[PDB]
Design a binder for this molecule. Structure first.
Ligand SMILES: [Mg+2]
Ligand SMILES: [Mg+2]
Ligand SMILES: [Mg+2]
Ligand SMILES: [Mg+2]
Ligand SMILES: [Mg+2]
Ligand SMILES: [Mg+2]
Ligand SMILES: [Mg+2]
Ligand SMILES: [Mg+2]
Ligand SMILES: [Mg+2]
Ligand SMILES: [Mg+2]
Ligand SMILES: [Mg+2]
Ligand SMILES: [Mg+2]
Ligand SMILES: [Mg+2]
Ligand SMILES: [Mg+2]
Ligand SMILES: [Mg+2]
Ligand SMILES: [Mg+2]
Ligand SMILES: [Mg+2]
Ligand SMILES: [Mg+2]
Ligand SMILES: [Zn+2]
Lengths: 143, 141, 157, 112, 67, 145, 100, 53, 70
RNA sequence: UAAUUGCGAUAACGAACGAGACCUUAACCUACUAAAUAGUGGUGCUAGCAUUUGCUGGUUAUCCACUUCUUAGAGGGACUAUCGGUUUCAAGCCGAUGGAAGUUUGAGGCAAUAACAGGUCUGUGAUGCCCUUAGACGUUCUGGGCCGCACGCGCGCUACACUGACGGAGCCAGCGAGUCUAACCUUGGCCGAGAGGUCUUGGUAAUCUUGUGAAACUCCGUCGUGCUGGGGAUAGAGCAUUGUAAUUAUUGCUCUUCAACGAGGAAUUCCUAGUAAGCGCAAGUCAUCAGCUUGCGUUGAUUACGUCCCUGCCCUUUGUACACACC
């Protein structure tokens, strides 16, 4: 009957595609991984130390699949959160731009996304086909 | 052409627009199936339009809902209202009045907000206090 | 190249400044208001007053100097701004004209009650439904107070 | 609430909704007292309680007991509400709401 | 409260005094004739006047009314 | 889902950098008790020392603890990016340090003493016992001592 | 020819009668037109303290100016274009005509 | 002298004033009107700002 | 409170002998009746579910509900 | 009756102001007029997964059609309608039904007479008198101060943790504002842990920023009753941005330091439903700086549906040695 990413729940799809990318092992994880926090509004680095870049990659790949074209500033706003400003009230703070820009470049190098006209990154046809194949596998795993 | 109706449901700022056409039984919300609506503690709140009348009513039609505005729970309420109103409007236009009245009676007997929008609106905030009613703290000394 | 919000606020403040200028200089001419009409290639300023002959002067000399004044101040090109004078009707039904006439009577030395009853009688004779004039301040004493003079009926809310 | 009903059905094989309504019926306070003038000193006069107030005050006592016993505790709020409703449904007197109801009725009986 | 003021009451009595056989015991028709037979500046005030007129017609049908 | 049987090799109190580091708590939040070692620095040092971060502090090997303290004492050698360091571009040597257990109080005393001996306004403020960061002192900090 | 006429007043009735006589002149001349698109009314608010000094109850006061905007698309030759831009002059109604 | 009035008035309250009364304080700068709040309450009806709600 | 944070032989065979005869098993149940930490309780819950001694009822985060398997 | 709102009574009759009416706003309209600056469907072109035909998308010069959703203009609609109780059986009130809506439908705006020796001469080129007026109390320049800290008060903000913190995911608003002789709101690309830098771009704006992808919230984990991974005051070091200038730290960022606080005594504030409370956002101020304010939406309870006990207010009667009037 055919499936797509929209037929699969977001969490288990993202987990399955992140595990697939980690097993494939050609994503070029930048190297300052295990140093950084992913946001100025965060206070601790990601707890899943050896992963989390495949998680962010699967998340941004699925996000670009659903949208038309997404850029780094939209990604920074999407992943930014409430910063605790000590004794002053909380506030929305954008996430790290270097992490999102490098994961966009990594997805471009493995061929999932591409540069779009009207700016930003849109999903490529290869990205569409293998995200759809991952959706098929993770919807079949329960059978 | 294909028999079809368009309806909507509302709750606060959330609006859901539903296209109900003749089909084979797919219920989609924002392009995803009805079984993936985000607060799963509230998933039965959009299941209950289907459940009160039975799925045989939905076997021969298919419904696509796009919801915007508001927040998470209000979008859930707008989705259920749009789906129920779409089924009633389809049975009004292309099926008979007996079936339309039975659907309307079942939905009304369970929950009036399945068909009639909740009319509660925000009250504007007034100066001299944080909210519409609440005032700043008064001190005397 | 200006936004519509700023343009409409700007011509509102232009109207307010022009009205203040005209009520500052044309007080003894019975100046009763101003109206502005923008037109392709020309904007026209209609002064509504009582003594149009004093507003104009000989061959409209005061009109020419008023056009030149508003031109020099508001940076208009030659020919783009034009002023007309117009005799207002129903002078009794003009609160600004009545207030200015009462002001000049009090400055000349009329008694307060005589001036106020003159203006209320003139307004009531002019066909108004009601008139009310209030004079506040140091009236015949160092302690200030307020005097009210009314005729007819007036609503408030 | 969903977790609480699951825990109730696990701990006792009863219908958890039946356990909830038994808790409410058992811990509604049947007589109370109200303040009067009393000539410059507070006196309390025993009065009866309407059934709607019994339901309201039963719910308030049950949830206040659960919230207080869950505060600063390894037990979760769902667990604390589960044993609160179970003990109130038994009338076991280890329930906060049962003890509060008994204390209020005893004070009213003294102040008849 | 739903107490109607003397403008509504006086207009209703005048309307009944000079238009009794023309107007009916139904609010919709009383509204539709009141808007053309009287000059009322507000739709709300016209509705209130027509409603009190209909109420007084029911009163008149159940025996005579003083005033 | 993985339970393990620990033996008698667990220790409850262990001694690093003249500090009684408690066992029984996980290694990064255990190492935060060393003064000059916070949560970010301890997390990064444990990652660079390649220990299981899930492990409690008391059940780690002596070589693992020595590797941890060696990395803490020389962070720039083990590729700590130098903006983690709490004493960088220091006023005397010019090099980036990360002060540790007693050195943090020693260097704080050094900094305050330098400010006092040149009679800078911050040093005079520290000598008096007042707030030095420009806060209003009219209403707060009344029982500050 | 692709002309667009934009009307941006604060006076609703004068705006509507200017729009009405433009569109009836267009249908009298049998010109194909996109009808008067009415943009969202933009409300300009200014909130101030009522008092000139600063004592008493803190009473606030919001003033607002409402801007109403409409536009009509016309496909008409140039002589009717000049006659349209020469007719329909109204005080308080700001009219502008643009081509292409 | 060139020392007179030499201090910059490019930003802050010393750069702006009420266009009516030349007051530095209480200025409303919204929509570029630059009128102090008291003068604005006097001339709001002339400008076009009205009270409705 | 001095809840055990690593487990040894007596704690292991104790939990293996009396996580049965518990009607309701959860993190706080294990913490209260066996004096182990919450982390050991979560690990032990997953382990006992994987062998199958306790049967899950609902397996939410922040609240785990297990019964005995018979 | 919310109301000197009315039914009525009646040495008064007829009126006027206030109240109400009114006006603005929020709710309804598959009825009208329309829309390439709002959307939807179909047809072109095209991607992926499937296999007759399907599903999810991309592309507006690719055209056509429509107006449900959106925006206005013009209108309609509620008048307590109908029915049943109750009341001299009048004005009205109570319940149920229908209805988008039935506490004057909700919220405002406007708002009388008489007054206070209320506040304001530091908003005003509004002002009388008094003072000063050239080593001026005018004005400008430089540097300080308005922030100074033994203490005592009033608004508030963060919290004392598991109904939580942290980490990954999920992922949704409404009100608004924005650059011309200027340099505003800024997408996208690149560099940087970050703050930020840089190259461009769209937008004088229902078009662009902006779906303002907000936060609380959800879901999986980590922690685990330990002032603890609660809390983040006070400090140290370094990197940036605004600005002529940041030293008494302008703010932002990074690492380190890690204090009180274990739910708060007498007292005392506010509040009746989309309200309280939680949660953030825009705007004002504004070169930079929100723990403030004015609005806006998101999540959404409990408990009244009363009374005159306290504190007050209105009307009538009554007493008074009060009239600057019980201070
Ligand atoms: Mg997040
Ligand atoms: Mg908070
Ligand atoms: Mg609130
Ligand atoms: Mg607890
Ligand atoms: Mg298409
Ligand atoms: Mg009746
Ligand atoms: Mg009202
Ligand atoms: Mg003054
Ligand atoms: Mg000050
Ligand atoms: Mg205050
Ligand atoms: Mg913390
Ligand atoms: Mg979280
Ligand atoms: Mg929006
Ligand atoms: Mg400042
Ligand atoms: Mg601000
Ligand atoms: Mg302020
Ligand atoms: Mg006596
Ligand atoms: Mg006396
Ligand atoms: Zn001014």
């Amino acid at each position: 009957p055919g499936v797509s990413v929209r037929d699969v729940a977001a969490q288990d799809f993202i987990n399955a595609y992140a595990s697939f990318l980690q097993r494939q092992g050609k994503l070029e994880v930048p190297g300052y991984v295990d140093i950084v926090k992913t946001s100025s509004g965060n206070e601790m680095p990601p707890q899943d130390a050896e992963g989390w870049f495949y998680k962010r990659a699967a998340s941004v790949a699925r996000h670009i699949y659903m949208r038309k074209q997404v850029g780094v500033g939209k990604l920074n706003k999407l992943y930014g959160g409430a910063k605790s400003r000590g004794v002053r009230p909380y506030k929305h703070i954008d996430a790290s731009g270097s992490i999102n820009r490098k994961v966009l470049q990594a997805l471009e190098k493995i061929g999932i996304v591409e540069i779009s006209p009207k700016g930003g990154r849109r999903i490529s046809e290869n990205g569409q086909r293998d995200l759809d194949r991952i959706a098929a596998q993770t919807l079949e795993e329960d059978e | 052409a294909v028999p079809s109706v368009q309806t909507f449901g509302k709750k606060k700022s959330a609006t859901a627009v539903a296209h109900v056409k003749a089909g084979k039984g797919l219920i989609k919300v924002n392009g995803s199936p009805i079984t993936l609506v985000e607060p799963e503690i509230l998933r039965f709140k959009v299941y209950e339009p289907l459940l009160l009348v039975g799925l045989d009513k939905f076997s021969n039609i298919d419904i696509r809902v796009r919801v915007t505005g508001g927040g998470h729970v209000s979008q859930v309420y707008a989705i259920r209202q749009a789906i129920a109103k779409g089924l009633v409007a389809y049975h009004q236009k292309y099926v008979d009045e007996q079936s339309k009245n039975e659907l309307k009676k079942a939905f009304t007997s369970y929950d009036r907000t399945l068909l009639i929008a909740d009319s509660r609106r925000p009250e504007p905030k007034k100066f001299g206090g944080k909210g519409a009613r609440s005032r700043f703290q008064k001190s005397y000394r | 190249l200006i936004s519509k919000k700023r343009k409409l606020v700007a011509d509102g403040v232009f109207y307010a400044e022009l009205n203040e200028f005209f009520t500052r200089e044309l007080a003894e001419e019975g100046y009763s208001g101003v109206e502005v009409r923008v037109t392709p290639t020309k904007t026209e300023v209609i002064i509504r007053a009582t003594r149009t002959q004093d507003v104009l002067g000989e061959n409209g000399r005061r009109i020419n100097e008023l056009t030149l004044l508003v031109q020099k101040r508001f940076k208009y090109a030659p020919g783009t701004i034009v002023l007309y004078a117009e005799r207002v009707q129903d002078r009794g039904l003009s609160a600004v004209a009545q207030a200015e006439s009462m002001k000049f009577k009090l400055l000349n030395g009329l008694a307060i009650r005589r001036a106020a009853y003159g203006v209320v009688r003139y307004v009531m004779e002019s066909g108004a439904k009601g008139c009310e004039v209030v004079v506040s301040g140091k009236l015949r004493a160092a302690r200030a107070k307020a005097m009210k003079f009314a005729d007819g009926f007036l609503i408030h809310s | 609430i969903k977790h609480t009903l699951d825990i109730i059905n696990v701990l006792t094989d009863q219908n958890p909704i039946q356990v909830v309504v038994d808790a409410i019926t058992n811990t509604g306070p049947r007589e109370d007292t109200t303040r009067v003038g009393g000539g410059g000193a507070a006196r309390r006069q025993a009065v009866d309680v309407s059934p709607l107030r019994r339901v309201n005050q039963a719910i308030a006592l049950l949830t206040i007991g659960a919230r207080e016993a869950a505060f600063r505790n390894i037990k979760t709020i769902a667990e604390t509400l589960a044993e609160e409703l179970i003990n109130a449904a038994k009338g076991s007197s280890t329930s906060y709401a049962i003890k509060k109801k008994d204390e209020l009725e005893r004070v009213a009986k003294s102040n008849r | 409260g739903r107490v109607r003021t003397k403008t509504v009451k006086r207009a209703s009595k005048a309307l009944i005094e000079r238009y009794y056989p023309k107007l009916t015991l139904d609010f919709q028709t009383n509204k539709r004739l009141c808007d053309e037979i009287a000059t009322i500046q507000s739709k709300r005030l016209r509705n209130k006047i027509a409603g009190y007129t209909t109420h007084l017609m029911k009163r008149i049908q159940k025996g005579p009314v003083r005033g | 889902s993985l339970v393990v049987q620990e033996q008698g090799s667990f220790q409850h109190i262990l001694r690093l950098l003249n500090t009684n580091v408690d066992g029984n708590i996980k290694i990064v939040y255990a190492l935060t008790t060393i003064k000059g070692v916070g949560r970010r620095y301890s997390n990064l040092v444990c990652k660079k020392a390649d220990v299981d971060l899930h492990k409690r502090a008391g059940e780690l090997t002596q070589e693992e603890l020595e590797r941890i303290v060696q990395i803490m004492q020389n962070p720039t050698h083990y590729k700590i990016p130098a903006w983690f360091l709490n004493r960088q571009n220091d006023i005397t040597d010019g090099k980036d340090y990360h002060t540790l257990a007693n050195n943090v109080e020693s260097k704080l005393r050094d900094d305050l003493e330098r400010l006092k001996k040149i009679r800078a306004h911050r040093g005079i403020r520290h000598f008096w016992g007042l707030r030095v960061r420009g806060q209003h002192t009219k209403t707060t900090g009344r029982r500050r001592a | 020819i692709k002309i667009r006429i934009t009307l941006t007043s604060t006076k609703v009735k004068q705006l509507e009668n200017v729009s009405s006589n433009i569109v009836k002149n267009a249908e009298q001349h049998n010109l194909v037109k996109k009808g008067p698109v009415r943009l969202p009314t933009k409300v300009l608010k200014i909130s101030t303290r009522k008092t000139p000094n600063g004592e008493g109850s803190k009473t606030w006061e919001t003033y607002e100016m409402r801007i109403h905007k409409r536009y009509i698309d016309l496909e008409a030759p140039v002589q009717i274009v000049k006659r349209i831009t020469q007719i329909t002059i109204e005080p308080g109604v700001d009219v502008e005509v643009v081509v292409a | 002298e060139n020392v007179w009035f030499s201090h910059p008035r490019r930003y802050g309250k010393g750069s702006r004033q009420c266009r009516v009364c030349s007051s530095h304080t209480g200025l409303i700068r919204k929509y570029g009107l630059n009128i102090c709040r008291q003068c604005f309450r006097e001339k709001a009806n002339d400008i076009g700002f009205n009270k409705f709600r | 409170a001095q809840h055990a944070v690593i487990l040894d032989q007596e704690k292991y065979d104790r939990i293996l002998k009396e996580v049965p005869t518990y009607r309701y098993v959860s993190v706080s149940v294990l913490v209260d009746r066996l004096k182990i930490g919450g982390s050991l309780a979560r690990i032990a819950l997953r382990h006992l579910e994987k062998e199958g001694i306790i049967k899950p009822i609902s397996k939410h985060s922040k609240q785990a509900i297990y019964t005995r398997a018979t």
